[PDB]
Design a protein around this nucleic acid. Structure first.
Ligand SMILES: [Zn+2]
Lengths: 65, 144, 76, 151, 192, 117, 142
RNA sequence: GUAAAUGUGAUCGAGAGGGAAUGAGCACUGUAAUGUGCACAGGAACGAGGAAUUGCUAGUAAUCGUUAUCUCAUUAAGAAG
């Protein structure tokens, strides 16, 4: 969701609306386990470093070198 | 007989400008860094508006050259030094911008800090106790 | 005592008499034998190399080397 | 080996001499006769142990012959002034500050000692500095305290 | 540009008619290999006596890349020694190369101190050095003398190189490297 | 003795200026906060201040106004009022004197007690 | 032919600089005597005529670009060419660009004299600016 | 924001090395500055480190930058290349 906030200008009579930018941990929860820490965001994964290593071989990653 | 004809002038040991003493043997650039409020950058700015060769030594300058520099220090804004080059910009007490020289610096910082303390500004209270005010961490470093 | 920012007449006179019979001479010699600063050893040395009293033998970057009247190079 | 640390000189207007029991020292190994490459700080507050659990103030291994060297400070102080300062024991015309007990080494030199003076007027002069073996101070009542020919 | 002849060091120096003048050293000092510039990448270090086949002035510039901050700055070393050869060739009057050779010959200590005792305490004794170690120490001392001399002194570094090398070749007390060779030999004799 | 002044302007003029005008005096970071417009909370705080200065008469003090608008710069409309600023624990009271202009309300309240070992 | 490569840069940049100043083809920025060339530099230039050495070196960048038939030069390209390593206290040194204002002024001066033509994706030379350089070199090598 | 060490010429001359605490400002990110950039000041310790102690055999160690690598609205003096 892109939430919106009202704000008043210097007159405290005219009003305008501004959008809250989506950033930080709050929307980047691990897709396997809902964790907020150690999330790999690369290649549009959104999976934590613990969960990655058990599933890596199912996805198709390998340790060649 | 041949003659050298490239020698500096007969030189004085030290001279007085600003209730400050300047070593006469020292070249004009690093020499004007003796007066409080004349850093390196601004020292070069003044000398090229007074129009003095940077390579002369402080004791070679005439009275005339010392008046030229004295005039530019009392009023930099007259000789096209812009306000973004100067010590004290948009003065809260005066609106104006001005360049503080010598003992004026400490006096101005003091009267400023003292006013904040009289009304309980937390920033002024910390500097009086020897603490830090620019967000630095005080656990590991800055002891004693 | 500190170094000096003039070559006065009697130091100038005796340096001419001293620069002959010396071989390689450099910025330091004028500044460590006599009392001159580096900024006045450059200017005097450059002057004598215009007067044909000394001759320059290297000037690579700022490293700069000169020769006087009793220099003599190798021969094949 | 035992070494007494004396403070010698001509003393005027001085009640007591107090000495920090911290000595920069040059040490020589008694096994290979080689001098230790650097001075070592010998402090009374440094706590070390011999291989027989005896307290010592310095434990150093000789870099050449690998032999252990030990030094113990015995303060000769008669009292502590302000619980901080070791009052050197007055002996005739000099002051006995401490006894250094070396094992496996010789003490070749003591470089400096931090000295404090208590005047006959009860004024403390901390961390006195000697110029050419001389120290002198005057109080607001024109009483002079001095040390001459300091050794 | 300057020449179309045979290979000379810095394109200036003769590179022939060179004598070692100590038969104990002969095989271990390369003054054969004709090179225009004291630089090679020849990968001999991965061999049993390959560091004895590297050319002489090469070994001498490597000795300059020191005091930590100057690691890897081999161009700077070449710049420095080039100038020194000009000073020396002038001062001495002979191929800078024979000055360098004679500096090495004099500056290596012949007898040394070592622990011999195995089946008990380690007791120090005199011992005799090999040809290879003797020259390794010579370069070390010549370098260490130069470095420490220049540190906080107004004189130019290429000039200090010429001061030391002449004196060393002439076996004078004036050389730091020569003095310290006397000290080691005297202590060796004390423990004989 | 001279009237109180902020960056050239007298308290008589300063108390009559719109917020839009006062913005030309303030420091850069405070200007950027007023350019980006007030929150719904800040507007209620300011309207109460304007009401209070108008309503109060005689010698009796007006009631305290409480706020969690910590980052708001002090304005010439809340001069002489008693205002409570939230410290993360309690509404710490203060009176807004003239010399406070050009600072935020957070600058006059400590969220952390001073340390003495 | 690629005539520019026949002479040494440290003889060409000083040579053209005099021809510029004696005809005033480029005019100094306000406060040129106290401004720095970048935020990475420590102090303002030691030569008062630094503005003209910039003008002389800008036309050299363009001559060699024309010689090698590259794509036209942009204001960003020139800013990275003249860049340097900035001092940051207690931190590693970092690469920073030259200031654009000097370069913009030089290019607009050269436009008014007909020496430089603006293309849709950069700046390019013109016949007069090429021929000045040609006629200089033909004396300078001889 | 598309290297830096580095290459040539000038310059400066032995606390013109160094940039710590701090002033009135001028901008940026942000919902919010407390975070970051810029200009003018200001100018602290530190002049090569006691007892001890940690890696490293060749394109290695150490030096120098750089990350369309990871953290990331804005923030690297961290890792991984
Ligand atoms: Zn997970």
């Amino acid at each position: 969701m892109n939430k919106q906030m009202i704000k008043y200008n210097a007159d405290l009579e005219t009003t305008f609306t501004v959008e809250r930018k989506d950033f930080g941990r709050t929307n980047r929860r691990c897709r396997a386990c809902f964790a907020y820490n150690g999330v790999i965001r690369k290649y549009d994964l959104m999976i934590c470093r613990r969960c990655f290593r058990e599933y890596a071989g199912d996805i198709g990653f390998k340790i060649y070198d | 007989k041949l003659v050298f004809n490239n020698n500096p002038l007969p030189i004085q040991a030290m001279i007085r400008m600003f209730n400050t003493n300047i070593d006469g043997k020292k070249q004009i650039i690093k020499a004007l860094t003796t007066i409080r409020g004349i850093g390196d950058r601004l020292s070069l700015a003044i000398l090229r508006r007074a129009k003095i060769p940077t390579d002369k030594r402080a004791g070679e300058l005439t009275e005339d050259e010392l008046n030229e520099i004295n005039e530019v220090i009392l009023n930099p804004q007259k000789y096209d030094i812009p306000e973004w080059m100067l010590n004290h910009q948009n003065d809260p007490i005066d609106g104006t911008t001005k360049h503080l020289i010598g003992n004026q610096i400490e006096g101005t910082i003091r009267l400023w800090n003292e006013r904040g303390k009289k009304i309980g500004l937390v920033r002024a209270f910390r500097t009086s106790l020897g603490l830090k005010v620019r967000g630095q961490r005080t656990k590991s470093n800055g002891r004693g | 005592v500190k170094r000096h920012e003039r070559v006065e007449d009697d130091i100038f006179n005796k340096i001419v008499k001293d620069v002959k019979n010396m071989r390689i001479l450099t910025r330091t010699t004028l500044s460590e034998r006599y009392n001159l600063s580096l900024n006045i050893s450059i200017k005097l040395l450059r002057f004598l190399e215009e007067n044909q009293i000394i001759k320059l033998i290297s000037s690579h970057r700022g490293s700069k080397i000169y020769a006087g009247s009793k220099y003599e190079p190798l021969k094949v | 080996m035992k070494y007494n640390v004396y403070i010698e000189g001509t003393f005027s207007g001085i009640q007591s001499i107090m000495v920090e029991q911290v000595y920069p020292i040059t040490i020589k190994c008694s096994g290979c006769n080689l001098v230790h490459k650097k001075d070592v700080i010998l402090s009374i507050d440094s706590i070390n142990y011999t291989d027989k659990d005896e307290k010592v103030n310095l434990k150093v291994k000789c870099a050449s012959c690998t032999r252990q060297m030990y030094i113990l400070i015995k303060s000769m102080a008669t009292e502590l002034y302000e619980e901080k300062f070791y009052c050197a024991k007055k002996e005739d015309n000099r002051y006995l500050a401490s006894q250094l007990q070396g094992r496996g080494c010789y003490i070749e030199k003591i470089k400096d000692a931090n000295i404090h003076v208590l005047s006959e007027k009860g004024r403390i002069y901390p961390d006195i500095v000697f110029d050419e073996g001389y120290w002198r101070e005057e109080d607001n009542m024109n009483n002079t305290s001095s040390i001459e020919d300091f050794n | 540009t300057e020449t179309s002849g045979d290979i000379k060091l810095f394109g200036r120096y003769p590179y022939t008619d060179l004598e070692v003048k100590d038969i104990t050293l002969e095989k271990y000092i390369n003054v054969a290999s004709k090179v225009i510039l004291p630089h090679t990448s020849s990968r001999l270090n991965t061999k049993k006596f390959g560091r004895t086949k590297i050319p002489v002035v090469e070994r001498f510039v490597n000795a300059m890349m020191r005091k930590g901050r100057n690691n890897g700055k081999k161009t700077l070393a070449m710049r420095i020694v080039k100038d020194a050869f000009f000073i020396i060739e002038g001062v001495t009057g002979q191929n800078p190369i024979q000055i360098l050779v004679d500096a090495i010959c004099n500056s290596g200590p012949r007898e040394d101190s070592a622990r011999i005792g195995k089946g008990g305490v380690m007791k120090r004794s005199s011992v005799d050095v090999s040809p290879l170690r003797r020259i390794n120490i010579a370069i070390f001392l010549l370098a260490k003398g130069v470095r420490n001399s220049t540190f906080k002194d107004i004189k130019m570094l290429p000039e200090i190189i010429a001061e030391e090398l002449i004196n060393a070749a002439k076996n004078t007390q004036s050389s730091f490297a020569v003095k310290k060779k006397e000290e080691i030999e005297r202590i060796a004799k004390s423990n004989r | 003795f001279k009237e109180f002044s902020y960056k050239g302007v007298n308290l008589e003029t300063l108390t009559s200026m719109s917020i839009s005008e006062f913005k030309e005096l303030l420091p850069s970071k405070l200007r950027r906060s007023i350019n980006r417009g007030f929150s719904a909370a800040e507007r209620d705080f300011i309207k109460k201040c304007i009401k209070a200065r108008s309503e109060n008469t005689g010698l009796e003090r007006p009631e305290q106004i409480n706020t969690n608008t910590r980052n708001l710069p002090i304005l010439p409309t809340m001069i002489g009022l008693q205002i409570g600023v939230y410290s993360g624990r309690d509404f710490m009271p203060m009176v807004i004197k003239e010399e406070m202009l050009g600072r935020r309300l957070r600058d006059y309240v400590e969220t952390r007690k001073l340390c003495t070992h | 032919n690629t005539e520019i490569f026949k002479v040494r840069h440290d003889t060409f940049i000083p040579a053209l600089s005099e021809y510029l100043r004696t005809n005033k083809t480029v005019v100094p920025i306000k406060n040129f005597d106290i401004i720095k060339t970048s935020r990475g530099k420590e102090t303002s230039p030691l030569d008062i005529n630094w503005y003209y050495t910039r003008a002389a070196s800008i036309i050299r960048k363009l001559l060699i670009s024309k010689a090698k038939n590259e794509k036209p030069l942009s204001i960003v390209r020139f800013s990275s060419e003249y860049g340097c390593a900035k001092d940051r206290g207690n931190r590693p040194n970092k690469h920073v660009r030259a200031s654009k204002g000097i370069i913009i002024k030089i290019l607009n001066d050269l436009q008014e004299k007909g020496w430089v033509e603006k293309k849709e994706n950069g700046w390019t030379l013109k016949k007069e600016a090429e021929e000045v350089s040609k006629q200089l070199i033909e004396k300078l090598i001889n």
